[PDB]
């Protein structure tokens, strides 16, 4: 009935309980024991229980003339394997796989000798420190780039704890009324990148830099400056396991996608331009029609590990039962390798 699980809505590692009645998810319950949020959730955390039921597609779909028609799993895994071996396939994944599934995806990427692949994320490959968010209050100086409270409310909670602890918090964004702008010790509405960087020159060594993805072009320079001068960088990634997937799969830095295979079990992928073919492996087609569709289990219907932005890793047993006809991404990968 009541089962522990992770909130998939953002990259904070908040724990929730799913209340299941007769095999279906019916509600949410506070997961007070979880250390990231201690049973506190934003609205999305309390709404996450509806995801496994909303517009769920649970049967493989191969695009017949014009539209998508049902098909058995073997007839899709074939017509996918041939596509891998023959055509120029680029594999793109969101930060919604389990860590083990990401390792398997790396194995596949090597086996089929794909040249372009990786994780969809605006952040680069960095030596991010493993920061405990409960330690955010310890930092004397915290620089916040982007609206961190809105991006991850339960990390903004720790920023508030830090403010109450005496830390001086400086916020930077292109807007001057965001939640961080309102609640920061000092806010700057910069229009030129150096504007923020100069102020970052005033930080002491060992200061915290909480950076969101709202300002993409600043991530590179800020990480370069933080690599120098010894700052601890805390990113706010896009997906609930962007960090875990990035551990194995590099961020995709190509822009010539055709015949792409999108692996988005969490349905978090933004509309991606596909010049050629479009294989979609998700829990709900919605969006546009894909050439092939492989329904998968939801984040809470799997067994596996997820890593939050801070670096907290959580091992999960399924909170629900996967609907008939859907396979975990691990099963798809293993069968594709076997074929």
């Amino acid at each position: 009935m009541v089962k522990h699980t992770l909130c998939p809505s953002c990259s904070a590692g908040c724990g929730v309980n799913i209340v299941e009645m007769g095999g279906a998810p019916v509600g949410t319950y506070p997961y007070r024991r979880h250390p990231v949020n201690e049973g506190k959730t934003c609205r999305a955390g309390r709404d996450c229980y509806e995801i496994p039921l909303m517009d769920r597609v649970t049967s493989p779909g191969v695009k017949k003339s014009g539209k998508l028609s049902g098909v058995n799993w073997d007839e899709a895994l074939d017509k996918l394997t041939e596509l891998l071996s023959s055509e120029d396939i680029s594999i793109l994944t969101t930060g919604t796989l389990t860590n083990e599934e990401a390792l398997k995806l790396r194995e596949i990427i090597e086996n089929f000798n794909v040249k372009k692949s990786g994780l969809i994320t605006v952040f680069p490959e960095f030596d991010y420190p493993e920061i405990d968010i409960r330690n955010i209050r310890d930092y004397d100086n915290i620089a916040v780039i982007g609206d961190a409270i809105t991006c991850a409310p339960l990390i903004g909670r720790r920023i508030f704890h830090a403010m109450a602890a005496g830390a001086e918090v400086r916020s930077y964004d292109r807007r001057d009324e965001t939640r961080m702008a309102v609640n920061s010790g000092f806010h700057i509405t910069f229009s030129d990148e150096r504007e923020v960087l100069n102020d970052l020159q005033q930080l002491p060594g060992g200061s915290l830099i909480i950076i969101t993805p709202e300002i993409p072009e600043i991530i590179g320079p800020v990480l370069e400056f933080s690599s120098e001068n010894e700052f601890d960088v805390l990113p706010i990634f896009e997906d609930f396991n962007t960090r875990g997937v990035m551990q194995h799969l590099p961020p995709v830095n190509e822009g010539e996608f055709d015949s792409v295979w999108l692996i988005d079990p969490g349905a978090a992928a933004e509309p991606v331009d596909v010049s050629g073919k479009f294989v979609l492996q998700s829990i709900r087609t919605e969006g546009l029609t894909p050439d092939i569709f492989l329904p998968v289990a939801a984040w809470c219907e799997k067994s596996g590990s997820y890593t939050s932005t801070a670096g907290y890793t959580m091992k999960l047993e399924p909170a629900l039962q996967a609907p008939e006809g859907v396979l975990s991404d691990m099963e798809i990968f293993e069968r594709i390798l076997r074929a």
Binding site: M1, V2, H4, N17, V19, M21, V26, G27, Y29, P30, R32, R33, P35, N37, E38, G39, K40, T41, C42, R43, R46, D147, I149, T150, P153, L154, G156, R157, F160, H161, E177, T178, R179, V182, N183
Partner: protein
């Protein structure tokens, strides 16, 4: 039969039971002899700090749910009203659970004929992570290696795996910002007389549960469990009844003193309240957690009230509206404050308002069977 001392005729249920296992034996009888369809209780997770609601449709392995959990400040009223309002149920309720269930029954969200309330005496609960940190800091032990908790002596007592007991003044822990939740310190009701039965260990011997029978439904429960040979029961001393009465009175006096402390003399100022309200992210966790806020559609989400920008809402059109809607029925369960992502002390203001209303009109939320005088149809 206003008073009894009871214990499970079984031996495993007695062993793993907190105080002779009368509650578990009663639930076992209720399921086996088909008084109800199911039992809603608690079960510990992967440690004593993780409590999870469980719905047992049969008594096999019921013993896994015995024992108290002071680090499990759970609420069952909204669970029953949202999911189990159709089935014949028996539930274990702390006084706040019974108060929420009574506020919901008078609003026809729960059928009183369907729900049997085996209430438990309650001296307060603690938050799990906070309890772990307190034990780490002030007991000089790992939060792990602890297997029980208790607040009998006025001391918070943890029972280490080996068998040792470590007790520290709950007054001293509370003075340091730890111990029971603030709403529990203000709580005025320790004996759930708004339940069919009230079970505790105040007037009870070791290995026995003191049970006060509040209603004839409770009397039927007790006599059915005793005739069916699930619980053995006898009469209290009537020297122990006075000890229990004195304990209840002393706890009530302490609750009144803490009410004065938190609601008047350490109450946040208007500037401090402004600083708090500036934080609110409009997540509605407080309303969702509140058992009295049961409505299918909430007025706080209407266009003319809902704050549509990504900024702190005006506390008037959110907090004052919710206060006008239900603050006369606020049971001081502290669920709103527990779940707030922004760490706002909401239960303080709601309890203070309810106290004003109760002082004026004499309505006590969760205890009176009738609706608040606000809803009276008479010319009174």
């Amino acid at each position: 039969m206003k008073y009894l001392l009871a214990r499970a005729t079984d031996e495993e249920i007695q062993r793993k039971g907190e105080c002779g296992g009368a509650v578990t034996a009663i639930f076992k009888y209720m399921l086996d002899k088909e008084v109800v369809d199911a039992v809603l209780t608690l079960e510990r997770g992967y440690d004593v700090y993780d409590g999870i609601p469980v719905l047992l449709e049969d008594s096999s392995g019921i013993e896994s749910t015995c024992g108290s959990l002071h680090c499990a400040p759970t609420m069952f009223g909204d669970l029953i009203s949202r999911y189990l309002s159709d089935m014949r149920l028996a539930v274990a309720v702390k006084p706040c659970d019974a108060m929420a269930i009574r506020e919901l029954e008078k609003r026809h969200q729960i059928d009183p004929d369907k729900v049997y309330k085996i209430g438990l005496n309650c001296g307060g609960t603690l938050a799990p992570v906070s309890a772990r940190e307190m034990i780490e800091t002030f007991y000089e032990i790992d939060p792990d290696d602890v297997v029980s908790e208790e607040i009998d002596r006025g001391k918070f007592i943890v029972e280490l795996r080996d068998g040792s007991h470590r007790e520290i003044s709950i007054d001293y822990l509370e003075e340091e910002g730890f111990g029971r939740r603030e709403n529990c310190q203000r709580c005025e009701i320790m004996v759930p007389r708004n339940a069919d039965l009230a079970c505790g260990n105040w007037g009870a011997d070791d290995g026995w549960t003191f049970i006060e029978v509040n209603t004839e439904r409770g009397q039927e429960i007790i006599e059915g469990a005793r005739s069916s040979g699930y619980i053995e029961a006898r009469e209290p001393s009537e020297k122990m009844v006075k000890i229990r009465e004195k304990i209840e009175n002393a706890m009530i006096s302490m609750a009144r003193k803490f009410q004065d402390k938190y609601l008047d003399e350490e109450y946040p100022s208007l500037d401090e309240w402004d600083e708090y309200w500036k934080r609110c992210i409009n997540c509605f966790a407080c309303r969702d957690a509140c058992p009295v806020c049961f409505c299918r559609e909430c007025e706080l989400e209407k266009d003319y009230l809902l704050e549509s920008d990504e900024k702190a809402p005006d506390p008037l059109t959110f907090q004052g509206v919710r206060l006008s809607h239900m603050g006369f029925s606020c049971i001081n369960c502290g669920q709103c404050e527990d779940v707030c992502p922004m760490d706002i002390p909401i239960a303080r203001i709601y309890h203070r308002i309810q106290k004003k209303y109760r002082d004026r009109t004499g309505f006590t939320a969760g205890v009176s069977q009738e609706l608040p005088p606000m809803y009276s149809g008479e010319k009174d």
